Short mmCIF file of C-alpha atoms and ligand atoms in Angstrom, two decimals:
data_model
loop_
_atom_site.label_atom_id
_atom_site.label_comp_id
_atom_site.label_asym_id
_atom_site.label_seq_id
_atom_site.Cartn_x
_atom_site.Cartn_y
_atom_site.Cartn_z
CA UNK A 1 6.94 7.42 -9.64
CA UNK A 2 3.52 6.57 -8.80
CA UNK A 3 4.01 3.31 -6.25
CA UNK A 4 0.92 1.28 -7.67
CA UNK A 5 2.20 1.78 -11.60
CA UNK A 6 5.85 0.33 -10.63
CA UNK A 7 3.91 -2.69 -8.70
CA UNK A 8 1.99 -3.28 -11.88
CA UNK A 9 5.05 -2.90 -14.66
CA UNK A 10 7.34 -4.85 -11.88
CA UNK A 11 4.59 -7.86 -12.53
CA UNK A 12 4.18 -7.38 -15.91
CA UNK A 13 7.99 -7.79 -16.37
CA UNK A 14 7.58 -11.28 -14.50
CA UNK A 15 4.51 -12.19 -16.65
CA UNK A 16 7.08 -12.63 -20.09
CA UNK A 17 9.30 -15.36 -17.78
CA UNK A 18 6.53 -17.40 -17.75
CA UNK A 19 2.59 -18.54 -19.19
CA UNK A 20 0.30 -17.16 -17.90
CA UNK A 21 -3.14 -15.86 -19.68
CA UNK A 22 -4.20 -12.27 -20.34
CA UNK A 23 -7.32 -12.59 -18.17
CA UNK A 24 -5.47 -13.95 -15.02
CA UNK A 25 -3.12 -11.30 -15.58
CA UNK A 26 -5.42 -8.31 -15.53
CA UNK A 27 -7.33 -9.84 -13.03
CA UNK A 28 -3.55 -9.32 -10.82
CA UNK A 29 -2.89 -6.10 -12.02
CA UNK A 30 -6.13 -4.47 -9.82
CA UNK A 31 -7.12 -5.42 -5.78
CA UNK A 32 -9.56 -7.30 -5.15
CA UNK A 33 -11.10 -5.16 -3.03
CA UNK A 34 -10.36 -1.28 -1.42
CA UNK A 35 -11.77 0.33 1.51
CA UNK A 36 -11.27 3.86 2.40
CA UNK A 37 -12.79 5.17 5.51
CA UNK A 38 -13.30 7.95 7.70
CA UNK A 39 -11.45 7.41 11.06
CA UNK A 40 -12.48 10.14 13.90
CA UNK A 41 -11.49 10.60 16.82
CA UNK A 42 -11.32 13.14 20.19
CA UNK A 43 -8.16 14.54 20.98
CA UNK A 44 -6.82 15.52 24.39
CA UNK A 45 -7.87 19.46 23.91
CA UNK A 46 -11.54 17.81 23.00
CA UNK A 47 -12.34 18.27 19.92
CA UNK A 48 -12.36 15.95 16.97
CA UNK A 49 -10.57 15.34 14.14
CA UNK A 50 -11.12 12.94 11.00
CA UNK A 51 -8.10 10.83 9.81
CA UNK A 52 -8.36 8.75 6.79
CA UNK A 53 -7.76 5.02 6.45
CA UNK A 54 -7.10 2.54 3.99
CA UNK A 55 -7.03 -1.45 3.62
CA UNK A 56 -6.36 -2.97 0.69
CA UNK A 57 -7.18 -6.13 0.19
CA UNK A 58 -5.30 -6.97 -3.33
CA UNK A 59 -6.23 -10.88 -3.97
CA UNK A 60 -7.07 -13.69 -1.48
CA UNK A 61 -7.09 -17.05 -3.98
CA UNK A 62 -4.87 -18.38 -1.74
CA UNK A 63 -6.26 -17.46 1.57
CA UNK A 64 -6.79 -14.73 4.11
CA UNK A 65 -5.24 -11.52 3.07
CA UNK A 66 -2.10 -10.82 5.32
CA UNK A 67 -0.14 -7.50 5.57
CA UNK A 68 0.53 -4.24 8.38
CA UNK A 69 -1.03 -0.89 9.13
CA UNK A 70 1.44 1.60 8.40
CA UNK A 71 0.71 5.22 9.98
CA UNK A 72 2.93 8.06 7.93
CA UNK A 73 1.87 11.64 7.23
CA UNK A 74 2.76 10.70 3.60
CA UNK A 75 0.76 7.54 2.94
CA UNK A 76 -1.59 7.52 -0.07
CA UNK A 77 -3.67 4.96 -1.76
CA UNK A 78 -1.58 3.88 -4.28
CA UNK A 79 1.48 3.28 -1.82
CA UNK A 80 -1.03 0.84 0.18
CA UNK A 81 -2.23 -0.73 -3.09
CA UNK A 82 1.54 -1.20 -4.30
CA UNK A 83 2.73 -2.66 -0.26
CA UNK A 84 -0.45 -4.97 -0.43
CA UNK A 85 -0.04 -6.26 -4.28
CA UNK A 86 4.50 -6.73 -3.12
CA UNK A 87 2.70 -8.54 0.07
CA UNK A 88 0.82 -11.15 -2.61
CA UNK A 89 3.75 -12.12 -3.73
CA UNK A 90 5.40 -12.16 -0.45
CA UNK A 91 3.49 -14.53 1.19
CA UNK A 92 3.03 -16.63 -2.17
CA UNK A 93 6.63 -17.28 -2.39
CA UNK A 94 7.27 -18.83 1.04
CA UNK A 95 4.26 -20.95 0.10
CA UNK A 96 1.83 -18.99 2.97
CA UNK A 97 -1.86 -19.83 3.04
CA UNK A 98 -2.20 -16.36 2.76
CA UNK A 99 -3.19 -13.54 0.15
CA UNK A 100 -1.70 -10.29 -0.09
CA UNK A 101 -3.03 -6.93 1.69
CA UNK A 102 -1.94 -3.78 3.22
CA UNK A 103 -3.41 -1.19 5.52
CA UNK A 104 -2.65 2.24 6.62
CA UNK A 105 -3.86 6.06 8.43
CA UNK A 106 -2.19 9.46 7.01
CA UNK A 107 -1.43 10.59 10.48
CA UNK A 108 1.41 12.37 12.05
CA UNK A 109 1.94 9.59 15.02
CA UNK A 110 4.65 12.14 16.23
CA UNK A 111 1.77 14.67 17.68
CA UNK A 112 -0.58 12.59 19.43
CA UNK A 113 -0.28 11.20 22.50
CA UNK A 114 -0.69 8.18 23.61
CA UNK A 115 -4.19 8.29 24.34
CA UNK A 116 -5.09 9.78 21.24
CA UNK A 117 -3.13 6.93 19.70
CA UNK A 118 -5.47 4.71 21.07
CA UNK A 119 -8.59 6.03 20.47
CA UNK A 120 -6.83 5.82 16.64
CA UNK A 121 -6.20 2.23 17.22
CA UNK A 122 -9.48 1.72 17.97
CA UNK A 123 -11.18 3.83 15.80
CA UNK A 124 -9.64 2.34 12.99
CA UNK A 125 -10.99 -1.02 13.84
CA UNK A 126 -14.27 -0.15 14.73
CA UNK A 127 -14.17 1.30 10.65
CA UNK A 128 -12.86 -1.55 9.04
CA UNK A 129 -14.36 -4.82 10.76
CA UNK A 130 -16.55 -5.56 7.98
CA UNK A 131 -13.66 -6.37 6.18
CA UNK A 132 -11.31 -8.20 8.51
CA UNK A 133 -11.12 -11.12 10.46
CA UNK A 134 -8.95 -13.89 11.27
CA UNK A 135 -9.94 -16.04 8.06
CA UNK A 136 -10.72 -12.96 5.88
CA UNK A 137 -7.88 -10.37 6.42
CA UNK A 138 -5.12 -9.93 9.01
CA UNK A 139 -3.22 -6.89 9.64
CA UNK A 140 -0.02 -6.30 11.70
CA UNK A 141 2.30 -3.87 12.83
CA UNK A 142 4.15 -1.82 10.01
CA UNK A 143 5.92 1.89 10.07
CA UNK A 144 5.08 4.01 12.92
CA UNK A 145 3.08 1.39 14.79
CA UNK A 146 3.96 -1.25 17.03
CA UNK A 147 2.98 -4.33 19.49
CA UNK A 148 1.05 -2.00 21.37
CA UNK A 149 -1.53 -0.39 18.76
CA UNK A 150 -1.83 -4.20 18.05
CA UNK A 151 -2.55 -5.13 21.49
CA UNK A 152 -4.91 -1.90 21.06
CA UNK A 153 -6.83 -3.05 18.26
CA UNK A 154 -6.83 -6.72 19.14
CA UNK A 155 -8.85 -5.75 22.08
CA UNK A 156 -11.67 -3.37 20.38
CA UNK A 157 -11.75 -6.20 17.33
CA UNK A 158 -12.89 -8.80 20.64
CA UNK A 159 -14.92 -6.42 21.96
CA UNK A 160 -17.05 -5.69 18.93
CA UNK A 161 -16.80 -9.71 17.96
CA UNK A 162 -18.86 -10.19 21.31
CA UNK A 163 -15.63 -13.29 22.08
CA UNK A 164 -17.38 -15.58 19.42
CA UNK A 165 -14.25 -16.82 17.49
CA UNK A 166 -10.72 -16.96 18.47
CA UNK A 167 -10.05 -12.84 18.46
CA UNK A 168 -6.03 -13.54 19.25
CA UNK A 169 -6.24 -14.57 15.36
CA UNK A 170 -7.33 -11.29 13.97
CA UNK A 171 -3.97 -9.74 13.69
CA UNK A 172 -0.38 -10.29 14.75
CA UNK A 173 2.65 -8.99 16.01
CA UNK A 174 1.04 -8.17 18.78
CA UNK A 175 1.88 -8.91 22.84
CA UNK A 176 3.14 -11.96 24.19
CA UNK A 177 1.04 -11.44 27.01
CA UNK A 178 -2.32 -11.60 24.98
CA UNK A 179 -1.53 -14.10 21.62
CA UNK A 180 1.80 -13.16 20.79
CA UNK A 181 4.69 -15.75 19.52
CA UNK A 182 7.96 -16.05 20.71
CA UNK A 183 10.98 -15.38 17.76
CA UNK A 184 9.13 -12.33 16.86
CA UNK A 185 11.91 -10.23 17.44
CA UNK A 186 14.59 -12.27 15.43
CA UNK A 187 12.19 -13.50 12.64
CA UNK A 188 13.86 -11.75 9.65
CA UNK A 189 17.97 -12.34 10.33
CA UNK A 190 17.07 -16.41 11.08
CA UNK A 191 15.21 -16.83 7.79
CA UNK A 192 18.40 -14.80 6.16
CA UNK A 193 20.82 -16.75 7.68
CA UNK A 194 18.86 -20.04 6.85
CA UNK A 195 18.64 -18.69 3.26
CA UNK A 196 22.79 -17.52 3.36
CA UNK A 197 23.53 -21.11 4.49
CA UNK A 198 21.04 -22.52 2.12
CA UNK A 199 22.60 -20.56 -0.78
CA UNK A 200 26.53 -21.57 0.01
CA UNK A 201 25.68 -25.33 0.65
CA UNK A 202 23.95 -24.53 -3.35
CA UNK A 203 27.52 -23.18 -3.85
CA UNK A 204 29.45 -25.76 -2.30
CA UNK A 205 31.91 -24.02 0.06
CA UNK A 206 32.17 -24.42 3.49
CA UNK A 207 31.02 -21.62 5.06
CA UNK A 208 33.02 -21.90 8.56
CA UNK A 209 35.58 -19.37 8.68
CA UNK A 210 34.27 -17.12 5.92
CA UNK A 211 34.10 -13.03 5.83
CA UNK A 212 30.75 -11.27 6.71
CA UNK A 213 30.16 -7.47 6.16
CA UNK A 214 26.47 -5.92 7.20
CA UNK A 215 25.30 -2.83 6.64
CA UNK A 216 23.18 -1.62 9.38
CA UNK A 217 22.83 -2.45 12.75
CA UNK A 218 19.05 -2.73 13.80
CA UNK A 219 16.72 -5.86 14.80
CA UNK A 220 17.55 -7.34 11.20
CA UNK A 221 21.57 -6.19 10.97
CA UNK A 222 22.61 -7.11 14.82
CA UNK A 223 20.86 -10.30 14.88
CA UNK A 224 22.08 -11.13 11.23
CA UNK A 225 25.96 -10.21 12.94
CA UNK A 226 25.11 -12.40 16.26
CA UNK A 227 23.56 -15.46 14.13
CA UNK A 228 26.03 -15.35 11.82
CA UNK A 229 28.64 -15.06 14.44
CA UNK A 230 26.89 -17.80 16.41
CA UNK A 231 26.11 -21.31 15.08
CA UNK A 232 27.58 -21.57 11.67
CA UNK A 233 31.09 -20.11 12.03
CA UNK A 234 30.63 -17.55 10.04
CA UNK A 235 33.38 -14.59 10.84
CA UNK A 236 32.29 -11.20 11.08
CA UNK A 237 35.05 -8.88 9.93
CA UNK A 238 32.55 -5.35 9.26
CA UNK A 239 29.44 -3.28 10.53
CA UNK A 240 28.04 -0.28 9.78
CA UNK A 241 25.14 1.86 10.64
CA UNK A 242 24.05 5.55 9.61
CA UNK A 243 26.90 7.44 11.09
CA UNK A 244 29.80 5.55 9.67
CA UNK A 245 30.78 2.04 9.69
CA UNK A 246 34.04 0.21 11.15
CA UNK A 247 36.36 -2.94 9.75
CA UNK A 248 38.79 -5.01 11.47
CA UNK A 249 40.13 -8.53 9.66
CA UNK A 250 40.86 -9.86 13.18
CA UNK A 251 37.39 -10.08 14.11
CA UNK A 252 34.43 -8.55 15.73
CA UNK A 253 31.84 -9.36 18.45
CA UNK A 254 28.22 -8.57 17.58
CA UNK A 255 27.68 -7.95 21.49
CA UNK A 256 30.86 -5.60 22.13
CA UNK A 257 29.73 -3.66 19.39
CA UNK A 258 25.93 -3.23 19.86
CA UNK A 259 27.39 -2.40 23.63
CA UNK A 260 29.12 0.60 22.33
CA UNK A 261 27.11 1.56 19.97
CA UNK A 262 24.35 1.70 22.56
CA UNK A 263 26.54 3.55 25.61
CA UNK A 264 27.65 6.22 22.58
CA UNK A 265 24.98 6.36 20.19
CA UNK A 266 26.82 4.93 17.26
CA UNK A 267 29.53 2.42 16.18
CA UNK A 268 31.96 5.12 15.00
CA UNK A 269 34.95 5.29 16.87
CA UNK A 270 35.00 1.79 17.71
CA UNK A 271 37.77 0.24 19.49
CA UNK A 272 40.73 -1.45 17.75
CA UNK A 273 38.93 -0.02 14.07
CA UNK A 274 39.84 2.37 11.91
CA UNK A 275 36.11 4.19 10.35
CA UNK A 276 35.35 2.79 7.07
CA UNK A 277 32.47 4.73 4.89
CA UNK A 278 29.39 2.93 3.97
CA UNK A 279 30.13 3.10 0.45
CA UNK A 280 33.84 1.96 1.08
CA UNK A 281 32.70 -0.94 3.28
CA UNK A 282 30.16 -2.40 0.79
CA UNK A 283 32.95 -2.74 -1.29
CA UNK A 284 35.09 -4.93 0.65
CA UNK A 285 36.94 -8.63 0.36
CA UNK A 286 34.09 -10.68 2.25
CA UNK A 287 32.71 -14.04 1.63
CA UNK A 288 28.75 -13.16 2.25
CA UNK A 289 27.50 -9.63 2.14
CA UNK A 290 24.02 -8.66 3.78
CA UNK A 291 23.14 -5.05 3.47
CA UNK A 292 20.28 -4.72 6.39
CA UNK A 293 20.19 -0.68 6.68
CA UNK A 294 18.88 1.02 4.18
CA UNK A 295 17.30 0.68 -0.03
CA UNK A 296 19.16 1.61 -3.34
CA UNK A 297 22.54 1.06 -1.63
CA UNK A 298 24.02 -0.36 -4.28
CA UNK A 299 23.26 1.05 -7.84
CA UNK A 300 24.48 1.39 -11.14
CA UNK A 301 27.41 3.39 -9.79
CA UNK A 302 28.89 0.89 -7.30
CA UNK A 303 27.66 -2.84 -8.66
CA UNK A 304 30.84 -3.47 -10.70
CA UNK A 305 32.86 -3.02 -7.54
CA UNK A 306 31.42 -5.33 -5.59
CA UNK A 307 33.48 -8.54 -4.67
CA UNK A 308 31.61 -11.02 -2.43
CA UNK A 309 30.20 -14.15 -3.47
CA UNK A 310 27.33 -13.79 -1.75
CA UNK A 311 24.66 -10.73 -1.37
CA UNK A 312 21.90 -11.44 0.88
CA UNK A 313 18.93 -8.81 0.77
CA UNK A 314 17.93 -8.15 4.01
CA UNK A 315 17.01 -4.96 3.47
CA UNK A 316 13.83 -3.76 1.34
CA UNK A 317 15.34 -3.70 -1.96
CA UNK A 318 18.99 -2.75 -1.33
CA UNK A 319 20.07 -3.44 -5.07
CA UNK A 320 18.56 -1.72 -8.31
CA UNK A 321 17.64 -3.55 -11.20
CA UNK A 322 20.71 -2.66 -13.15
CA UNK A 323 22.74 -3.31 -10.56
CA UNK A 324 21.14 -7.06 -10.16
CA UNK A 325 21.85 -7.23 -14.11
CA UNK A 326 25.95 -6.51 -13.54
CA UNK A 327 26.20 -8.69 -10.36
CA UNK A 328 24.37 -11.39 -12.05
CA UNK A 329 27.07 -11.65 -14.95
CA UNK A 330 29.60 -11.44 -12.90
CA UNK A 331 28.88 -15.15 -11.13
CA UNK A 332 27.89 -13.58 -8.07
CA UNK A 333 24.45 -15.35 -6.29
CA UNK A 334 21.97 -12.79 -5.37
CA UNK A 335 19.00 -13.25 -2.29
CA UNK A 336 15.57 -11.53 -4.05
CA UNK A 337 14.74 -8.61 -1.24
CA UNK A 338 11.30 -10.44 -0.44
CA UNK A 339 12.76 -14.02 -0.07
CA UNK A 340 15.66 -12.91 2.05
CA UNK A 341 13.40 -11.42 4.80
CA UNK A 342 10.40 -13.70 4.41
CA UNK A 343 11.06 -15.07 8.15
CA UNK A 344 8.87 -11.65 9.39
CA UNK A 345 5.83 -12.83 7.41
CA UNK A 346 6.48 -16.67 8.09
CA UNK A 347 6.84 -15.92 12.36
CA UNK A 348 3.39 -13.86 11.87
CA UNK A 349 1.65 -16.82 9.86
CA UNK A 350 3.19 -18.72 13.23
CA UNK A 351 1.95 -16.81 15.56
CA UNK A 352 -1.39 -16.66 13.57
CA UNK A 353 -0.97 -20.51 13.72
CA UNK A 354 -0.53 -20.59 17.38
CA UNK A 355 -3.91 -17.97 18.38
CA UNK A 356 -6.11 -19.92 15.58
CA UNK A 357 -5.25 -23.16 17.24
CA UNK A 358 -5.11 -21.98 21.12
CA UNK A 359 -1.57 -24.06 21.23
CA UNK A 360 1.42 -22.12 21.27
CA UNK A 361 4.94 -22.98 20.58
CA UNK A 362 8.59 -22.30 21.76
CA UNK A 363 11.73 -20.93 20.67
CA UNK A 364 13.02 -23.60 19.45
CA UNK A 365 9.84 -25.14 17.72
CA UNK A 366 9.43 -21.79 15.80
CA UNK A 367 13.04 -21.74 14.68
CA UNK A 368 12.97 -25.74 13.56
CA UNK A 369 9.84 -24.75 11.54
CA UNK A 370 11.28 -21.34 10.07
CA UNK A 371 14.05 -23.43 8.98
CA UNK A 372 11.70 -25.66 6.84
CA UNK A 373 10.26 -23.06 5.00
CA UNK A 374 13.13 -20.75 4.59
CA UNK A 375 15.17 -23.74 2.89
CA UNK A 376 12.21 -24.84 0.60
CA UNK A 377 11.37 -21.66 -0.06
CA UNK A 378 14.94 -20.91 -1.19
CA UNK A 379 15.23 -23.52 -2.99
CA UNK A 380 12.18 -23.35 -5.45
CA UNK A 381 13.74 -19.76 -6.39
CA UNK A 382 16.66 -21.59 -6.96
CA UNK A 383 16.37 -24.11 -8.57
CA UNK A 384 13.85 -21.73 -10.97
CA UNK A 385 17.04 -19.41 -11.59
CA UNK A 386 19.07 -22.47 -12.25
CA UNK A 387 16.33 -23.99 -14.80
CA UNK A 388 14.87 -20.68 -16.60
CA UNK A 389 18.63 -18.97 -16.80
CA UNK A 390 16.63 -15.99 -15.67
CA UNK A 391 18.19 -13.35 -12.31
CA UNK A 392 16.76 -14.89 -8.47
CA UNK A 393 14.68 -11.80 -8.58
CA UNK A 394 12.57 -13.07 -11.85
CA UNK A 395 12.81 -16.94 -10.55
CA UNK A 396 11.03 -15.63 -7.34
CA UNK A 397 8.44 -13.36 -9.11
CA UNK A 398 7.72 -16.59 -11.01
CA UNK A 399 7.43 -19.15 -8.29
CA UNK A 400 5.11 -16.90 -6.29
CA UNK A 401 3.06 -15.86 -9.34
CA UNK A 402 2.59 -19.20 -10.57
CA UNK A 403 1.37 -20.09 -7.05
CA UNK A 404 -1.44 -17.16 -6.87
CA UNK A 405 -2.39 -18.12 -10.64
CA UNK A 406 -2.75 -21.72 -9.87
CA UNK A 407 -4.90 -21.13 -7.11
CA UNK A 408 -6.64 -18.45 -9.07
CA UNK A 409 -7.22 -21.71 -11.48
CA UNK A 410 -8.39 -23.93 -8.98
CA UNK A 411 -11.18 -21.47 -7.31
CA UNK A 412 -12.28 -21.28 -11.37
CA UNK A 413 -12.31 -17.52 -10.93
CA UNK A 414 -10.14 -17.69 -14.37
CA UNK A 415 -10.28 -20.39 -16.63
CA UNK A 416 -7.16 -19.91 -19.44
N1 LIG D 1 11.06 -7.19 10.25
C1 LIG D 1 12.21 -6.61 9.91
O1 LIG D 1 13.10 -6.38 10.73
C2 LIG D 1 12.40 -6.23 8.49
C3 LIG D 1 13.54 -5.62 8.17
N2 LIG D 1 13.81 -5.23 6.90
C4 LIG D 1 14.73 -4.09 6.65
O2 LIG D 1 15.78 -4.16 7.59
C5 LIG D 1 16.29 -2.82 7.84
C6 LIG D 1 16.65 -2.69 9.30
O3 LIG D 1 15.53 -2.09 10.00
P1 LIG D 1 14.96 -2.81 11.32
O4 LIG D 1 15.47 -4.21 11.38
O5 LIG D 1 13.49 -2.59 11.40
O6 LIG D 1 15.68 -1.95 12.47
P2 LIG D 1 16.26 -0.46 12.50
O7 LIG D 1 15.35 0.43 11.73
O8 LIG D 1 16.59 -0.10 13.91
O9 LIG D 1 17.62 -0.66 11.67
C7 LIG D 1 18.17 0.47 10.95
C8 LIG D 1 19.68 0.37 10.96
O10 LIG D 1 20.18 0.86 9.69
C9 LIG D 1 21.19 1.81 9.94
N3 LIG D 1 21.17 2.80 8.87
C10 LIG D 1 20.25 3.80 8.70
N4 LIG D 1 20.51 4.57 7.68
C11 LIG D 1 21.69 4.06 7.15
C12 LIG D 1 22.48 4.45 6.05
N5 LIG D 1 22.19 5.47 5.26
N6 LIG D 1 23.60 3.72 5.80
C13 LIG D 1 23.88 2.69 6.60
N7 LIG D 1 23.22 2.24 7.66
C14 LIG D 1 22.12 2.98 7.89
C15 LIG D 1 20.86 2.41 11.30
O11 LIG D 1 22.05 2.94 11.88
P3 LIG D 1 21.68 4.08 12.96
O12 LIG D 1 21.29 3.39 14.25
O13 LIG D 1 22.94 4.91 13.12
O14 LIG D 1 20.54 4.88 12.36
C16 LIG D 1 20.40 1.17 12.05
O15 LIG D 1 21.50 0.46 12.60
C17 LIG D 1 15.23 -1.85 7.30
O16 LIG D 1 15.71 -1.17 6.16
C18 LIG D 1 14.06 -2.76 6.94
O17 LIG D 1 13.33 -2.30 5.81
C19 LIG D 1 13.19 -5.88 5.86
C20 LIG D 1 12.03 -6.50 6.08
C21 LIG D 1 11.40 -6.43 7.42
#
């Protein structure tokens, strides 16, 4: 279905949970502003060939519009529109200074090289400037495109801004060598660990001890196994990636696994485990359960089998609707997708923090402060489940839509 339409009925179905006017909400259903360009280049053979871009700028009441260039041979308009209206809300729900946009290039990254990625990189600055800057829009790395095409475009974006303002600002993600922040890399598993502990101190168990199963085993899944299995106690007894997956009640180590995994290309086979199937190992007697892989992975099918009493959504939407409405009844607390992973988006306002200011922090500094605003942030969804009697995916939709339409308020650009 068309990616912009399900943005626009997903807010619509938050807009009944709470008051909010007609205008405001029309004014929320449409960006703010759209640019499509023309992006040419010169390839390696020497001719050249026009690539089209897109930015999205979908509402910037409460600052700067934040969100990554994607580069897929699939992209379209309305998938950039939908990322950059989800990226709003995003950044409005860990209470960002930031409004919500999205960029992206149809391009087949696969079949250029890595000059001819760069003369992309730079092309596609040199086309959208007028739009971007570090207090009007700031872009970041996304699919298909990496620390590297942001170290790329950071550079042209100085060189056309003739080194007037602070340049590092302009996007993030990129370098640590030019602007970039330290906890990049681990951003998204210590904001969902902060919100798993956040969520069982709500439920009042002790966590130490406790069964964790993760789906996945990437930046977010590994890091979500180490961290968990690191300073809270918490026991890992599963993992899983693509291939298969693996379960032992004994115990795992995050490190002897990613170890194997790495010397023979998956964690199947594992020592000392017998090979448990995805589908098998989301259903499984565990205490906290973070699917980090993969969307739709549990659905209407499988959500009356689960058994945890915690889901944490590391992943981009790894539970359906339905599925949210039978796990819900059944007393088990759900993570909303885009609260779970918020510590991505709060690391880049950091680092945008850090190039803005010409100060820059450390590891631990950035982890202290991630821990602030993953625990308030959890907390307002919360305690708006808690108070509305509504699912943690609603609660969030109307914390974060509340926040844009009270800013929208305040800036007078609606008055009701
Ligand atoms: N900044 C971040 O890290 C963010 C992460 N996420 C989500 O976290 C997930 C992890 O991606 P990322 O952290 O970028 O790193 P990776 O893309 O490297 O992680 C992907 C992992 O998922 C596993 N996987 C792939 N397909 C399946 C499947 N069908 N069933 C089970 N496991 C599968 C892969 O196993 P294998 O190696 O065998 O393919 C791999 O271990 C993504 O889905 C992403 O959307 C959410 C927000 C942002």
């Amino acid at each position: 279905i068309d990616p912009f339409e399900m943005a626009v009925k997903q807010l619509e179905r938050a807009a009944q949970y709470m008051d909010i006017s007609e205008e405001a909400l029309e004014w929320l259903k449409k960006p703010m502003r759209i640019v499509e360009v023309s992006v040419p280049i010169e390839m390696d053979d020497g001719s050249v060939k026009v690539f089209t871009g897109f930015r999205v700028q979908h509402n910037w009441a409460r600052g700067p519009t934040k969100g990554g260039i994607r580069w897929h041979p699939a992209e379209t308009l309305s998938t950039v529109k939908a990322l950059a209206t989800f990226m709003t809300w995003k950044v409005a729900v860990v209470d960002l200074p930031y409004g919500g946009g999205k960029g992206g290039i149809i391009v087949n990254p696969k079949e250029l090289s890595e000059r001819e990625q760069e003369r992309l990189a730079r092309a596609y600055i040199r086309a959208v400037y007028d739009v971007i800057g570090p207090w009007t829009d700031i872009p970041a790395p996304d699919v298909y495109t990496n620390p590297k095409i942001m170290g790329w475009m950071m550079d042209e974006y100085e060189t056309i801004m003739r080194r007037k303002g602070p340049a590092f600002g302009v996007i993030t993600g990129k370098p640590l060598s030019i602007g970039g922040s330290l906890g990049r890399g681990t951003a998204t598993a210590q904001g969902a660990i902060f919100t798993i502990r956040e969520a069982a101190k709500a439920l009042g168990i002790d966590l130490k001890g406790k069964k964790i199963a993760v789906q996945g085993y990437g930046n977010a899944g590994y890091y979500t196994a180490k961290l968990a299995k690191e300073q809270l106690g918490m026991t890992v007894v599963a993992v899983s990636d693509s291939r298969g997956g693996i379960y032992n009640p004994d115990g795992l180590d995050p490190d002897e696994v990613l170890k194997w995994k790495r010397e023979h290309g998956s964690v199947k086979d594992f020592p000392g485990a017998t090979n448990i199937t995805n589908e098998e190992l989301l259903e499984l007697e565990v205490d906290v359960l973070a699917p980090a892989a993969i969307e739709e992975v549990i659905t209407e099918k499988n959500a009356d089998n689960i058994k945890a009493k915690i889901v944490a959504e590391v992943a981009n939407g790894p539970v359906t609707p339905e599925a949210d409405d039978i796990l819900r009844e059944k007393g088990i607390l759900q993570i909303p997708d885009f609260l779970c992973n918020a510590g991505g988006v709060t690391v880049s306002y950091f680092e945008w923090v850090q190039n803005i200011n010409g100060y820059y922090w450390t590891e631990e500094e950035v982890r202290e402060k991630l821990d602030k605003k993953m625990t308030k942030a959890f907390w307002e969804v919360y305690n708006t489940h808690k108070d509305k009697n509504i699912h943690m995916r609603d609660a969030a939709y109307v914390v974060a839509v509340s926040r844009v339409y009270q800013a929208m308020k305040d800036r007078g650009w609606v008055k009701k």
